[PDB]
Amino acid sequence: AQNPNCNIMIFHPTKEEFNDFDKYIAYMESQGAHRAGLAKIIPPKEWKARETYDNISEILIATPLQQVASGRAGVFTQYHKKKKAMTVGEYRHLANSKKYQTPPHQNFEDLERKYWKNRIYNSPIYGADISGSLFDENTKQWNLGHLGTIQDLLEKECGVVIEGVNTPYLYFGMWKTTFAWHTEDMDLYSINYLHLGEPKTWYVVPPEHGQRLERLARELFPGSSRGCGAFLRHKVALISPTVLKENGIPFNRITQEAGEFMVTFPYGYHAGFNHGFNCAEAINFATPRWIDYGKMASQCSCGEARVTFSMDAFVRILQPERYDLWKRGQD
Ligand SMILES: O=C(O)CNC(=O)C(=O)O
Ligand SMILES: [Mg+2]
Ligand code: NI
Ligand SMILES: [Zn+2]
């Protein structure tokens, strides 16, 4: 069995190996990459996502989200308070202001210590979940707006044609902006490209151990757990590496830098934080190996998780028994 300790693997494809996206995912899996839940892919030196980032300031962040924490430093939830619209140029200036800017630090490990010590005492503002793309149309390799769609994959594997679309999303971050512990909708893959700016630190639980994280979360967030049998779908709970180690939960960590891709694998729980002003692009995707995970994915039916139009068909076809309850949660 490849990668039996579930370490995060880093790949360096050549320009030739970067042509065929599906083939390279399947290659990484042949080497055991999925066992970690997360892999890093460093593009060949010949590749670029676009020519420059000099002309992005007029993109609008219609609903910036202020991430307000409650709890203790290593075990907290966050809620998202909506703020007035602002442009990317306005948000960048805000991120760089004395109130929000990255503090002085020695290295990534010092900054990580400062994040976990101090995150809860601040409320950073995240420009998340913005439909759009920064890949040039002429970039043919690993262009996250030109991937095979999940609806086409389901149709190729199972024969059923379904409605829905699959487009990318932009994330504009600042110091301390936070992504809570989650797996993807329907336990899909994700791919994330860090276009510019400061790093993103990731934490991940191997898919084979995901239920250990879920059991810890029910213990640490007992009110939330009574409210919903899949409350990590709400994407609000944070647990620090120190607390995970104290409770024996297997996990790994890695820092993504500008110009690098990260892939999350089906049922790989992940969480993390941004180091300073940055912009990432991400999208969900599927492969044949996903289908079995989609059929078994938990679902939130309490009303909180509310998701895209395109998840309807995935529930309806892969999980018909659960469909009626889940759709009630959507309505
Ligand atoms: O970058 C973020 O805020 C969160 N991204 C992801 O969870 C992802 O790409 O799967
Ligand atoms: Mg612009
Ligand atoms: Ni994710
Ligand atoms: Zn719920």
- The residues near 138 (Cβ < 8 Å, ≥ 6 apart) are none
Closest atom of ligand 1 relative to the 284 alpha carbon: 10
| Closest to 10 in 3D by CA, of 1, 32, 18, 20 | 32
DSSP H or E segment with residue 71? strand 65-72
Resolution to 1 decimal place, in Å: 1.4
Lookup: tokens for 97? 């202001």
User: Residues 75, 76, 81, CA angle at the centre, nearest 5°?
Assistant: 165
Residue 130 CA to ligand 2 centre (angstroms): 14
Q: Alpha-carbon distance 106 to 49, whole Å?
A: 30
126 is in an annotated binding site: yes
- Do residues 195 and 261 make contact, with C-beta atoms less than 8 angstroms apart? no
Q: Alpha-carbon distance 50 to 139, whole Å?
A: 7
What secondary structure letter does DSSP report for 50? Answer: -
Residue whose entry in the numeric block shows the structure tokens 């676009």: 50
Q: Alpha-carbon distance 129 to 106, whole Å?
A: 31
Pocket test for ligand 1, best of 126, 255, 264 (most atoms within 8 A of CB): 264
- Do residues 240 and 116 make contact, with C-beta atoms less than 8 angstroms apart? yes
Q: Which fold has domain 1-331?
A: Jelly Rolls (2.60.120)
Closest atom of ligand 1 relative to the 178 alpha carbon: 3
200 is in an annotated binding site: yes
Pocket test for ligand 1, best of 40, 190, 255, 307 (most atoms within 8 A of CB): 190
If DSSP codes are grouped into helix, strand and coil, which group holds residue 154?
helix
CA of residue 303 relative to chain centroid, distance = 21
- The residues near 54 (Cβ < 8 Å, ≥ 6 apart) are none
279 is in an annotated binding site: no
Domain ranges of the chain: 1-331
Q: Are strands 9-11 and 38-41 parallel, antiparallel or unpaired?
A: parallel
Beta-carbon neighbour count of residue 16 at 10 Å? 8
The radius of gyration of the chain from alpha carbons, rounded to an integer in Å, stands at: 19
Give the DSSP letter string of 110-147. HHHHHHHHHGGG---EEEEEEE---S-TT--SS-TTSS
If DSSP codes are grouped into helix, strand and coil, which group holds residue 250?
coil
| Torsional class of 306: left (φ above 0), alpha (ψ -120 to 50), beta (otherwise) | left
Beta strands per DSSP E along 174-291: 178-182, 189-197, 200-205, 237-239, 252-256, 261-264, 269-274, 278-285
- Do residues 280 and 260 make contact, with C-beta atoms less than 8 angstroms apart? no
Ligand 1 contacts (CB < 6 A) are 171, 179, 190, 192, 264, 270, 280, 282
| Closest to 166 in 3D by CA, of 4, 318, 310 | 310
What secondary structure letter does DSSP report for 160? Answer: -
Ion ligand 3 neighbours (CB, 5 A) are: 190
Q: Alpha-carbon distance 89 to 327, whole Å?
A: 39
